[PDB]
C-alpha cells in the first residue's frame, strides 16, 4: 500500500477500475468493450 500511495493510475489504458486504486486488494474489472482482447497468462 505504501507503493500504491506513490503509484499513478493509468487512465489511458482501456481498463478502468470500479473499486478505487488506492488500497490493495482484489478488484473485479468492468465488462470491457466488445470483441474482447488484452488477455495475459501470469
Amino acid at each position: 500500500p505504501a507503493q500504491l500511495k506513490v503509484l499513478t493510475m493509468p487512465e489511458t489504458c482501456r481498463y478502468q477500475p470500479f473499486k478505487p486504486l488506492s488500497i490493495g486488494g482484489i478488484i473485479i474489472l468492468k465488462d470491457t468493450s466488445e470483441d474482447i482482447e488484452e488477455l495475459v497468462e501470469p
Binding site: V6, G25, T32
Partner: protein, 136 residues
C-alpha cells in the same frame, strides 16, 4: 539468544521493503549476509541469523507475513504462526508453523472466472524500488 532474536526481528521488520523506507535496510541485509558467512559465531546466534535471512528473503520478495489486514484487523492465523515461531526456546523443531502466516499482496483485475485480463498499472515516483533487487 537475544542476539538471534534481534536478528530475526530486524529481518521481520525489513521483509518486503527496500532501502527506500530507510537507508539502513541495505546495511542490515549486508549485516545478515556477513553474519551468516561468519561461521565462528555461537550456535544460537548463527541459527537465528540464518532464520532471519530466510524470513527476510521469504519467497524472493514475493510473500510476506503481516498482521495488518485489508481493513486493518489482526490476522489471527498469522498471529499464532508467529507465536509458534517465537516459541523456539520451548521447542525449535515445533516452531515451524509460520507457513500459515503468509499474507501476499496483489491488485487483481479478474473480470471473468478464468480469463485473466491484461490489467496493467504504472508508476512515476522515482524513490520506489521492489521486485527482486538481487543483492548478491
Amino acid at each position: 539468544y537475544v542476539r538471534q532474536g534481534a536478528l530475526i526481528a530486524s529481518a521481520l521488520i525489513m521483509i518486503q521493503q527496500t532501502e527506500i523506507t530507510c537507508p539502513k535496510v541495505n546495511q542490515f541485509r549486508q549485516l545478515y549476509s556477513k553474519v551468516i558467512n561468519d561461521k565462528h559465531d555461537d550456535v544460537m546466534a548463527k541459527f537465528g541469523a540464518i532464520l532471519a535471512q530466510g524470513i527476510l528473503d521469504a519467497g524472493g520478495h514475493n510473500v510476506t507475513i503481516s498482521l495488518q489486514s485489508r481493513t486493518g484487523h489482526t490476522h489471527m492465523p498469522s498471529v499464532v504462526g508467529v507465536l509458534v515461531f517465537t516459541q523456539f526456546w520451548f521447542w525449535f523443531p515445533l516452531s515451524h508453523f509460520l507457513s500459515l502466516a503468509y499474507t501476499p499482496t496483489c491488485v487483481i483485475g479478474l473480470n471473468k472466472d478464468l480469463k485473466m485480463p491484461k490489467v496493467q498499472y504504472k508508476s512515476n515516483c522515482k524513490p520506489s524500488t521492489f521486485a527482486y533487487p538481487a543483492p548478491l
